[PDB]
RNA sequence: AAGCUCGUAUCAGUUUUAUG
RNA sequence: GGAAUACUGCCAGCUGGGACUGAGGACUGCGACGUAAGUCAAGGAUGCUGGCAUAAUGGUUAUAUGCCGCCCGUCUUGAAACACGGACCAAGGAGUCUAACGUCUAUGCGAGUGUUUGGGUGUAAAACCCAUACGCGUAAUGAACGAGGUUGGGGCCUCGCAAGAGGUGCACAAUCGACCGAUCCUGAGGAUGGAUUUGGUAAGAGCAUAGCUGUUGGGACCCGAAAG
RNA sequence: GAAAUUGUUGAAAGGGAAGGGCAUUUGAUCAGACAUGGUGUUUUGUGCCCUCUGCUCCUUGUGGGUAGGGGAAUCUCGCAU
C-alpha cells in the first residue's frame, strides 16, 4: 500500500534523501517534480504521479497510474507537449483532467521552469568568450615557480645588461 | 493580530460603544445643567 | 466519448454546495442578529448614560438641599475599590502574600477590582503596607476597561476588542457589551463576582509623571504611596495607565 | 498526559491516526476512549478471555451490541456455548479465532469496527483484569 | 515516573461567621 | 448687587514638535462614510524620490578611548576565608565487562511459551527446520448453593433543539451474601448441632527475546594505606 | 611537519606587569557580477511548422519514435537576424 511505502520511505533510509543543513530533505529522483522527499511529492510513495521531463529539447508530460504498478518497465506514459507555452499549458490542463490541484499546479510550474531553462541557448548563442576556465594543478604551479626562480638566478640580468651596454656604445653611436 | 487601543483612532472606537457617535454629535461631554 | 467526473468528486461537490447554502443562511442570520444586537447595545448605552447623569445630578441636588436645610447629609457608603500592588514579589511575609495571591496581585503594578465588604476590608487592612487602593471613578474604570481590558477565555487571556467576545462568555448573565461590563463593575450587582473573575488582572505601568513622593514605602497620609487614598487613586491609575 | 504511543508498529500508528481523526472530527466520546486506550502499554492492556466475553454477553440486548476489545482476545477451554456476536480487537489468537468463527461469529479489525461504527453504534468495550 | 477513578465542591501559610 | 478668575474632576473636545517598531502575507469578521454605486485611519505599510560595478557597503588584527571585570579546579565551615594542584606544551587517562535477582518499555505467541545441550542441513564459526526430554505458568486455605444480587461506574441505546429524563453497563470500589478447606466448642468411637471469622476462586497471564535502568560478587569509576 | 620554545624582519604599545567584556575612530588587509537581460511589435532564413506519401514500437492511448517529395506571398508553432 502507498501508506506502508510512504512510511518505509519517510524513515528507514529511503535511498534518495539528502539531509540539507537547513533540515529540508531533498529528493534526487529524476521523476520528482519538486525534488523534495515529502508527501504527495515522491513518485515511489504515490500510485498516481505526474511530472515533466525532457531528453532532447522536446518537453514531455510523464504521468503514472496504479495500473502499471505491476509492470515497472512502462510505468510512465509520456506525451509530447507540442512546445508552446500557452498551448502546452492548455494541453497539460486537458490531460490532467480531474487531477489534484497540487499535481496540476506543480506540473505546470515544472514545465514553465524547464521551458525558461531553454534560454541557455541565449548564453550559447551569445557567449564569444575568451577565458574558457582553466585549472592549474599545484604540481604544475610548483614547476612554474621554483624553475622560474632558478631561471632568474641563473640569468644574471644585470651582468647581461652591462655587457650589452658596453658593446652597443663601443663600436658606434 | 494587533490590538487597536480605543480612546484614539476613532475608527476602532466606533466599533465598540455605538453610542459614541451620539455622544460626539450631541456634545454630551460638555452638557450644561 | 466524454470523460465523466469522478463519483467521489461529484459527492464532494454536492456536499460542498449543500454546506455552502447553510453557510450563506447562517451568514444572513448572523448579520441580522448583529444589527439587532448593535441597536440593543446602543439603547442600553444611552440608558446607562442617562442613569449616570441622573444619579450624579441627584447626588449634587441632595447635597445642596442638605446644605440649605441645615441638616447633615448622609453620603452613600463606598462599594467599589481598586487595589494596585506596590511592593515586589520577594521578601513578603507569607500571610500578606497569600492574601495578595488570592486577590491576583501576583506582580508589581498590577491591580484588580475588589468588592467592598466587612470581610474584604479586613483583607485590605492586612495587606495595607504592600498595596494602595481607593475609590475609582467612572472615567478611570472606563479607561481601564478600554485600554487594558483583557478577558479570561478557556484559560486564555483574550484581549477585549469586540462586543461579540464579551457576549459569548458573559452573555449568560445578560452582559453582552463592554459598556454592560463597565456598568456592572462600577455599579456592583448580582453578577459582580463573575465579571471580576472574567477580567484578567490588569497589567499597569509605572506612573508617567512619577509617584510624586520621595519615599513610596510610607502611609499615604504622611507623604507615602501605600494606604487608602480615597480620590487620588484615580489620578495614580491614570498616570500609571 | 498520555499523548502518543511508544509502540513502533506502523499499523498501530495508522490506527492511531484514524482514531484521532475520528475523535477530532466527530466529538464522539466512544472514539476518544479507544484512542486513549491505544496508548496503553502491554501491561496496561491485559488480554480479554473469550469466556470473559461470553460472560459479558449475558447482559440484556447483547445480540444487537457488538463487543470491542482494545487488547488481544485469548481462547478459553472452560466455555463451549459461545453465542454469535461480532468481536473487534487488534489481535486474535488462533484458538479464540477458531472458537469465534466456529460458533458462527465474525472477527474483525479496529478499522472494520470504525467503518461499521464511526460513532460507536451499539459498541461494547471490555477491559481485561489488571491483576 | 506509569495506572485508575476525574474536575470538581478537591482545597487555602487568607477573612468573616458559628459553636464556645 | 452682580459677574469673572484660582483649585478639583470630565470631555466617546480640537490641534502641533520628537523617538522606536513595519510584525502578518490573495477575501472570508467586527465596524465607519455614503440614498445608491462605491470608499475608508476598519483582525500589522503603502507610493515616490537620491547613491551603484575601477560601486554601494560589509568582514579580521592592534593600537586610539567612555565604563566594568579579584586566578582557575577540589575540599573545610552556615560563609567568605584558610588547606592541595597548576613553569609551558603534544599523546594517553577513568560508572567498562560479566552471573543472579527486579521495575519500566516493544515485539512473537498466549494457556501455552523457550529452534541453536544436539541432530538434519548448509554458498560453511555464515543461513533454515526440530523426534523426545527439560525451565516457567496454567487451580484456593468443591471452585456450579448459582461459575451472584444491589448500589456507582469510563461507555452504549431511547426521549429531548438543548437542559436534562429513562433502559443497559467493562475494568474497578462498597454492600448483601455464599463456598474450598478450619478454627472455638459439642458429643452420635466423631456424627450432629451452635460462634466467630478465615485467604481466595469465582470467567487464567505467563514465556523468551531486545533497550535505559536498581541491588549483590567478581580488580568493579581510576591511583594511592603499616603488610603475612 | 602541530603546541610550548628560540632568532631575524615589519607593525604597535610600555613611568613600580598584564590579560578579558559592552562600545566606537585609524593603518593595514579581505570580499565585492567571468550579472546584463524581459515584454509586444516590424523584415528576412530555417525547423520538430504547412501539405502529400511513408516506416516502426508498445499495447489501443487524450499515445511514442522516425523517413522521402514540395513552401512561405500565411508566418510567429519554436528557433536565427
UniProtKB/Swiss-Prot annotation, chain A:
<dbReference type="GO" id="GO:0000460">
    <property type="term" value="P:maturation of 5.8S rRNA"/>
</dbReference>
<dbReference type="GO" id="GO:0042273">
    <property type="term" value="P:ribosomal large subunit biogenesis"/>
</dbReference>
<feature type="short sequence motif" description="Nuclear localization signal">
    <location>
        <begin position="138"/>
        <end position="143"/>
    </location>
</feature>
<dbReference type="GO" id="GO:0000463">
    <property type="term" value="P:maturation of LSU-rRNA from tricistronic rRNA transcript (SSU-rRNA, 5.8S rRNA, LSU-rRNA)"/>
</dbReference>
<keyword id="KW-0539">Nucleus</keyword>
<dbReference type="GO" id="GO:0030687">
    <property type="term" value="C:preribosome, large subunit precursor"/>
</dbReference>
<dbReference type="GO" id="GO:0000470">
    <property type="term" value="P:maturation of LSU-rRNA"/>
</dbReference>
<keyword id="KW-0677">Repeat</keyword>
<dbReference type="GO" id="GO:0000466">
    <property type="term" value="P:maturation of 5.8S rRNA from tricistronic rRNA transcript (SSU-rRNA, 5.8S rRNA, LSU-rRNA)"/>
</dbReference>
<comment type="function">
    <text>Its role might be as part of the apparatus concerned with the nuclear events of the cell cycle.</text>
</comment>
<comment type="similarity">
    <text>Belongs to the MAK16 family.</text>
</comment>
<dbReference type="GO" id="GO:0005730">
    <property type="term" value="C:nucleolus"/>
</dbReference>
From Swiss-Prot, chain B:
<comment type="similarity">
    <text>Belongs to the universal ribosomal protein uL4 family.</text>
</comment>
<comment type="subunit">
    <text>Component of the large ribosomal subunit (LSU). Mature yeast ribosomes consist of a small (40S) and a large (60S) subunit. The 40S small subunit contains 1 molecule of ribosomal RNA (18S rRNA) and 33 different proteins (encoded by 57 genes). The large 60S subunit contains 3 rRNA molecules (25S, 5.8S and 5S rRNA) and 46 different proteins (encoded by 81 genes). uL4 is associated with the polypeptide exit tunnel. uL4 interacts with its chaperone ACL4 and the nuclear import receptor KAP104.</text>
</comment>
<comment type="function">
    <text>Component of the ribosome, a large ribonucleoprotein complex responsible for the synthesis of proteins in the cell. The small ribosomal subunit (SSU) binds messenger RNAs (mRNAs) and translates the encoded message by selecting cognate aminoacyl-transfer RNA (tRNA) molecules. The large subunit (LSU) contains the ribosomal catalytic site termed the peptidyl transferase center (PTC), which catalyzes the formation of peptide bonds, thereby polymerizing the amino acids delivered by tRNAs into a polypeptide chain.</text>
</comment>
<protein>
    <recommendedName>
        <fullName>Large ribosomal subunit protein uL4A</fullName>
    </recommendedName>
</protein>
From Swiss-Prot, chain C:
<dbReference type="InterPro" id="IPR039699">
    <property type="entry name" value="Ribosomal_uL30"/>
</dbReference>
<dbReference type="GO" id="GO:0000463">
    <property type="term" value="P:maturation of LSU-rRNA from tricistronic rRNA transcript (SSU-rRNA, 5.8S rRNA, LSU-rRNA)"/>
</dbReference>
<keyword id="KW-0963">Cytoplasm</keyword>
<comment type="function">
    <text>Component of the ribosome, a large ribonucleoprotein complex responsible for the synthesis of proteins in the cell. The small ribosomal subunit (SSU) binds messenger RNAs (mRNAs) and translates the encoded message by selecting cognate aminoacyl-transfer RNA (tRNA) molecules. The large subunit (LSU) contains the ribosomal catalytic site termed the peptidyl transferase center (PTC), which catalyzes the formation of peptide bonds, thereby polymerizing the amino acids delivered by tRNAs into a polypeptide chain.</text>
</comment>
<comment type="similarity">
    <text>Belongs to the universal ribosomal protein uL30 family.</text>
</comment>
<protein>
    <recommendedName>
        <fullName>Large ribosomal subunit protein uL30A</fullName>
    </recommendedName>
</protein>
<keyword id="KW-0687">Ribonucleoprotein</keyword>
<dbReference type="GO" id="GO:0002181">
    <property type="term" value="P:cytoplasmic translation"/>
</dbReference>
<dbReference type="InterPro" id="IPR018038">
    <property type="entry name" value="Ribosomal_uL30_CS"/>
</dbReference>
<dbReference type="GO" id="GO:0022625">
    <property type="term" value="C:cytosolic large ribosomal subunit"/>
</dbReference>
<dbReference type="GO" id="GO:0005737">
    <property type="term" value="C:cytoplasm"/>
</dbReference>
<dbReference type="GO" id="GO:0003735">
    <property type="term" value="F:structural constituent of ribosome"/>
</dbReference>
From Swiss-Prot, chain D:
<feature type="cross-link" description="Glycyl lysine isopeptide (Lys-Gly) (interchain with G-Cter in ubiquitin)">
    <location>
        <position position="102"/>
    </location>
</feature>
<keyword id="KW-0963">Cytoplasm</keyword>
<dbReference type="GO" id="GO:0022625">
    <property type="term" value="C:cytosolic large ribosomal subunit"/>
</dbReference>
<keyword id="KW-0832">Ubl conjugation</keyword>
<dbReference type="GO" id="GO:0005829">
    <property type="term" value="C:cytosol"/>
</dbReference>
<feature type="modified residue" description="N6,N6,N6-trimethyllysine">
    <location>
        <position position="36"/>
    </location>
</feature>
<dbReference type="GO" id="GO:0003735">
    <property type="term" value="F:structural constituent of ribosome"/>
</dbReference>
<comment type="function">
    <text>Component of the ribosome, a large ribonucleoprotein complex responsible for the synthesis of proteins in the cell. The small ribosomal subunit (SSU) binds messenger RNAs (mRNAs) and translates the encoded message by selecting cognate aminoacyl-transfer RNA (tRNA) molecules. The large subunit (LSU) contains the ribosomal catalytic site termed the peptidyl transferase center (PTC), which catalyzes the formation of peptide bonds, thereby polymerizing the amino acids delivered by tRNAs into a polypeptide chain.</text>
</comment>
<keyword id="KW-0687">Ribonucleoprotein</keyword>
<comment type="subunit">
    <text>Component of the large ribosomal subunit (LSU). Mature yeast ribosomes consist of a small (40S) and a large (60S) subunit. The 40S small subunit contains 1 molecule of ribosomal RNA (18S rRNA) and 33 different proteins (encoded by 57 genes). The large 60S subunit contains 3 rRNA molecules (25S, 5.8S and 5S rRNA) and 46 different proteins (encoded by 81 genes). eL18 interacts with NAP1.</text>
</comment>
<keyword id="KW-0689">Ribosomal protein</keyword>
<protein>
    <recommendedName>
        <fullName>Large ribosomal subunit protein eL18A</fullName>
    </recommendedName>
</protein>
Amino acid at each position: 500500500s502507498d501508506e506502508i511505502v510512504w512510511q518505509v520511505i519517510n524513515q528507514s533510509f529511503c535511498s534518495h534523501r539528502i539531509k540539507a543543513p537547513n533540515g529540508q530533505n531533498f529528493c534526487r529522483n529524476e521523476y520528482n517534480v519538486t525534488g523534495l522527499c515529502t508527501r504527495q511529492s515522491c513518485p515511489l510513495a504515490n500510485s498516481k504521479y505526474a511530472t515533466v521531463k525532457c531528453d532532447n529539447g522536446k518537453l514531455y508530460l510523464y504521468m503514472k497510474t496504479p495500473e502499471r504498478a505491476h509492470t515497472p518497465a512502462k510505468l510512465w506514459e509520456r506525451i509530447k507537449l507540442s512546445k508552446n507555452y500557452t498551448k502546452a499549458l492548455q494541453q497539460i490542463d486537458e490531460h490532467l483532467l480531474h487531477w489534484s490541484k497540487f499535481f496540476r499546479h506543480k506540473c505546470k510550474q515544472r514545465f514553465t521552469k524547464l521551458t525558461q531553462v531553454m534560454i541557455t541557448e541565449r548564453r550559447l548563442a551569445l557567449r564569444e568568450e575568451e577565458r574558457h576556465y582553466v585549472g592549474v594543478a599545484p604540481k604544475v604551479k610548483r614547476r612554474e615557480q621554483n624553475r622560474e626562480r632558478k631561471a632568474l638566478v641563473a640569468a644574471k640580468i644585470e651582468k647581461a645588461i652591462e655587457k650589452e651596454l658596453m658593446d652597443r656604445l663601443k663600436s658606434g653611436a | 493580530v494587533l490590538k487597536k487601543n480605543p480612546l484614539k483612532n476613532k475608527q476602532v472606537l466606533l466599533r465598540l460603544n455605538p453610542y459614541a457617535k451620539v455622544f460626539a454629535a450631541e456634545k454630551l461631554g460638555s452638557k450644561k445643567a | 466519448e466524454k470523460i465523466l467526473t469522478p463519483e467521489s468528486q461529484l459527492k464532494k461537490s454536492k456536499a460542498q454546495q449543500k454546506t455552502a447554502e447553510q453557510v450563506a443562511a447562517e451568514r444572513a442570520a448572523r448579520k441580522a442578529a448583529n444589527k439587532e444586537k448593535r441597536a440593543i447595545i446602543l439603547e442600553r448605552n444611552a440608558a446607562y448614560q442617562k442613569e449616570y447623569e441622573t444619579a450624579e445630578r441627584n447626588i449634587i441636588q441632595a447635597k445642596r438641599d442638605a446644605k440649605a436645610a441645615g441638616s447633615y447629609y448622609v453620603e452613600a457608603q463606598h462599594k467599589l475599590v481598586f487595589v494596585v500592588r506596590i511592593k515586589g514579589i520577594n521578601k513578603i511575609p507569607p500571610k500578606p502574600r497569600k492574601v495578595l495571591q488570592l486577590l491576583r496581585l501576583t506582580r508589581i503594578n498590577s491591580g484588580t477590582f475588589v468588592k467592598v465588604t466587612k470581610a474584604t476590608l479586613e483583607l485590605l487592612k492586612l495587606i495595607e503596607p504592600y498595596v494602595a487602593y481607593g475609590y475609582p471613578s467612572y472615567s478611570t474604570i472606563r479607561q481601564l476597561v478600554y485600554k487594558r481590558g483583557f478577558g479570561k477565555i478557556n484559560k486564555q487571556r483574550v484581549p477585549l476588542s469586540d462586543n461579540a467576545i464579551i457576549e459569548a462568555n458573559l452573555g449568560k448573565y445578560g452582559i453582552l457589551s463592554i459598556d454592560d461590563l463597565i456598568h456592572e463593575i462600577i455599579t456592583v450587582g448580582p453578577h459582580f463576582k463573575q465579571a471580576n473573575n472574567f477580567l484578567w488582572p490588569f497589567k499597569l505601568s509605572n506612573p508617567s509623571g512619577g509617584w510624586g513622593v520621595p519615599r513610596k514605602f510610607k502611609h499615604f497620609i504622611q507623604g507615602g504611596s501605600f494606604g487608602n487614598r480615597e480620590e487620588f487613586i484615580n489620578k495614580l491609575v491614570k498616570s500609571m495607565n | 498526559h498520555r499523548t502518543a504511543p511508544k509502540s513502533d508498529n506502523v499499523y498501530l500508528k495508522l490506527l492511531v491516526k484514524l482514531y484521532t481523526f475520528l475523535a477530532r472530527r466527530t466529538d464522539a466520546p466512544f472514539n476518544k476512549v479507544v484512542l486513549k486506550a491505544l496508548f496503553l502499554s502491554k501491561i496496561n492492556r491485559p488480554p480479554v478471555s473469550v469466556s470473559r466475553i461470553a460472560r459479558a454477553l449475558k447482559q440484556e440486548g447483547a445480540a444487537n451490541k457488538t463487543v470491542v476489545v482494545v487488547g488481544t482476545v485469548t481462547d478459553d477451554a472452560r466455555i463451549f456455548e459461545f453465542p454469535k456476536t461480532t468481536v473487534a480487537a487488534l489481535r486474535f489468537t488462533a484458538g479464540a479465532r477458531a472458537k469465534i468463527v466456529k460458533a458462527g461469529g465474525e472477527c474483525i479489525t479496529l478499522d472494520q469496527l470504525a467503518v461499521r461504527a464511526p460513532k460507536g453504534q451499539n459498541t461494547l468495550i471490555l477491559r481485561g483484569p489488571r491483576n
